[PDB]
Design a protein around this ligand. Sequence first.
Ligand SMILES: O=c1ccn([C@@H]2O[C@H](COP(=O)(O)O)[C@@H](O)[C@H]2O)c(=O)[nH]1
Ligand SMILES: O=c1ccn([C@@H]2O[C@H](COP(=O)(O)O)[C@@H](O)[C@H]2O)c(=O)[nH]1
Ligand SMILES: O=c1ccn([C@@H]2O[C@H](COP(=O)(O)O)[C@@H](O)[C@H]2O)c(=O)[nH]1
Ligand SMILES: O=c1ccn([C@@H]2O[C@H](COP(=O)(O)O)[C@@H](O)[C@H]2O)c(=O)[nH]1
Lengths: 224, 224, 224, 224
Amino acid sequence: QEESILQDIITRFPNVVLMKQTAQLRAMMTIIRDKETPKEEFVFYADRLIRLLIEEALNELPFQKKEVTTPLDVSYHGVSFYSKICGVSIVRAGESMESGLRAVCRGVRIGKILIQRDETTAEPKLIYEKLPADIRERWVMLLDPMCATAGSVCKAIEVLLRLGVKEERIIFVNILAAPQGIERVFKEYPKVRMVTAAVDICLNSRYYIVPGIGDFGDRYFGTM
Amino acid sequence: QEESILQDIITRFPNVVLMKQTAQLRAMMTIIRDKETPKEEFVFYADRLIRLLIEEALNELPFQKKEVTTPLDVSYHGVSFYSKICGVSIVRAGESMESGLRAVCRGVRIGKILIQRDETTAEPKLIYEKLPADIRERWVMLLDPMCATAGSVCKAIEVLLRLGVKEERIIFVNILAAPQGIERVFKEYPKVRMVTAAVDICLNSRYYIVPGIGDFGDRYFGTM
Amino acid sequence: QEESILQDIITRFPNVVLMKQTAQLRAMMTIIRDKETPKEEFVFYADRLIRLLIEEALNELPFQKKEVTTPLDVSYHGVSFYSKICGVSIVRAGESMESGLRAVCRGVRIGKILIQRDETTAEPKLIYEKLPADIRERWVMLLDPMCATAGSVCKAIEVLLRLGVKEERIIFVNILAAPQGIERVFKEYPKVRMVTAAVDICLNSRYYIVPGIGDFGDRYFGTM
Amino acid sequence: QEESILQDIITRFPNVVLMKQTAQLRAMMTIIRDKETPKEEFVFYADRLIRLLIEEALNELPFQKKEVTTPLDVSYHGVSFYSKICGVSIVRAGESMESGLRAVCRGVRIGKILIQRDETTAEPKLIYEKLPADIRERWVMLLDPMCATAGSVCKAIEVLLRLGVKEERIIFVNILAAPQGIERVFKEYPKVRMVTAAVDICLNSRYYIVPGIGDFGDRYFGTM
Ligand SMILES: O=c1ccn([C@@H]2O[C@H](COP(=O)(O)O)[C@@H](O)[C@H]2O)c(=O)[nH]1
Ligand SMILES: O=c1ccn([C@@H]2O[C@H](COP(=O)(O)O)[C@@H](O)[C@H]2O)c(=O)[nH]1
Ligand SMILES: O=c1ccn([C@@H]2O[C@H](COP(=O)(O)O)[C@@H](O)[C@H]2O)c(=O)[nH]1
Ligand SMILES: O=c1ccn([C@@H]2O[C@H](COP(=O)(O)O)[C@@H](O)[C@H]2O)c(=O)[nH]1
């Protein structure tokens, strides 16, 4: 059922890249998903998985061929990445991913976006944001560990676009998604790319993914 | 060219695991192979790449199957790794990899083996070793960035075997290898597993891997 | 002169604790105060200094004598810390210290408070908060690298007190402070403790500490 | 008792630097000495303390005055550390201090020395060394957690001297020491500098520091 779900996502949305489902990745996910898991452990594994995730997403950037000479005076033909990038986190869950991104891209600029779902209805509302000034000229790693209804991420993209960010330069880095959130982002922004570690079954009336992980932000920051 | 070589090795040596040759992997290999690269950069990147190699390697261990119940109170089908392991570094170069292993495996036991070639005789002699008392009962993550003639690694393996380690329980974790080294390892210990990030074309007159990386141990510790 | 300001602060407010002015500390502040310093560097040194600062702050917590026995089988008399704690950061500048606290206090719960002065009025207003549920029972490490007019931190303190946190259980961790900001905090909440690494001469019409460091928040997140 | 001891040493040996005996420091020491502490904790806490230790040691280096202009367009009078340095690990115990050094001094050059006492004779002998080529020009941070009889460090210093390093440029970084140890090092090389976290009572009938911590290298690498 998962396999089938996984494949269908894959065949339906060419712009999503699913991390290789290795045993270790599964191990990590079980620890993280487990209710029983203690906070220090949750953080430790969440952190480990995020780095792999980040490494995977970085492969979505553009690169050029570059040739160098080895200390053995022989040429090596490689490549180099030359783009202006930055990470944008959705507060506060996405914030949990900044350290990951900062670990591999020393001093990368970090923008933050705070979105709130309205009380009457629940249309997401932009509450606060601090972004790099030249963001319009950057590739964007948009960080949000969980994509359920996709309401938040779609709002974040709306603002990014409004500011001038090229839709095709947005890379959505995610840990766990629901087919429905996936469908929504692509129906609204077909050009963005999305990298995720997992696709779950459904959402509940409370809009939590299931089997899911619970409230990522509460778990990672320990504000249960 | 490289593809040919790779195919052969992949075909003849069913126990080697080449890591996914991603653009990122390549970019990292390009910086660390560059003779112009400054030491700080050299260290940052090697570390980054080592991290990925280690993660790749851990997939070689055996795991069970484990079910957990999520906060949504539904159950999830996962896995867990239950083996006793340890890492063993070949001094000095292998040492560079210890930080990576400790990073993902808090408090993992670390054994050290200093092998040195007689200055006249050219042969490997075990100079110093300090291993965990029950190493005979664990999986050994053998660490050595480079594999040229396979002289050193072969001797390291011989000592491990004399202590009672099971051949099939050694996972040789390597960054760069020459075909001949790979071929030799397998001739002598057909049952070990080898994880590596690159396979070079050949050794040169001084038995240096080419195009190669130079002397890993010197570039990493700065005793150039 | 600095000495004079330093001493004056020190004799006037028994509750503040100034980090020891070592040359290294000063080398650090030098790097980060220099408008010439590149983001990666700034980040680098800022994190380094934050680690020390945090370690310093951690000594304000209460401890118990504890006796253990060495592997040599003789006793040692130690002094364990047994209190419950948490960090609360003032978004977004304070968030920069979060990683430091987490580095040394594995999985410490982190609360966040987002405040903003009114354009006209200048009354700092609470915009958002997410804190641990039982914060009333904890000791709190309030994090804000810069304390100028102290408006924001006094507002942050107000809400903590409203929430039930005991004033004397609040430890304000700060990098740079203005004498004026210090005086306000103590006029309003004499029972809190403050740990800073440096006291500057004054504040400007735009409310920046001088000679100061500029806007810590953009400098650190790269949104300048 | 201990207060007497510290006083004597401090008085008789103007070149030793004891870290401030803070409650936190004590707390870390209690966990590390405790024979019941698990290997992960042992490592986490030793790393933390080693980090403070190195930061302390770095103050032993020479520094220049430096003035910079802040973003407020105003001058600040700082200092700069200009010396070329390197870390020198005494294998294997000192290797545990490397990460700490590399954490604060990115890509700093790391030399290694393996000294061993003859199984029969007990004479400490140089078994293996790999040092920077220009070590004579640098300031040396000699690392070794424990200093019992000082036989090892004495030998290490001796070889450094034969290479041309100035006795005055050797900063011996140590976690724990015995009075005898300190005394000998100062009798033989009155000019080195020594930074340490604690000084214990005495040595065992078997030359172990008491109350001590036991065999640090075994406890840290997990080969006990
Ligand atoms: O089970 C869930 C689902 C979502 N969220 C978080 O709440 C936000 C709302 O998700 P969505 O409904 O916009 O997609 C996301 O940023 C996500 O990180 C969780 O903490 N838990
Ligand atoms: O290009 C090379 C080849 C080997 N080595 C190092 O030299 C030693 C001898 O390797 P081998 O010939 O046994 O495989 C190993 O420890 C390896 O790390 C290098 O630094 N660079
Ligand atoms: O020179 C300064 C002074 C203050 N702040 C920031 O301005 C905010 C308001 O400071 P205050 O006037 O309430 O203390 C704080 O979050 C603080 O980090 C700066 O970045 N630089
Ligand atoms: O309680 C002790 C005393 C010494 N040593 C180690 O024994 C070696 C010899 O110490 P010494 O007697 O030369 O000073 C050193 O490398 C030191 O780390 C221990 O591990 N534990």
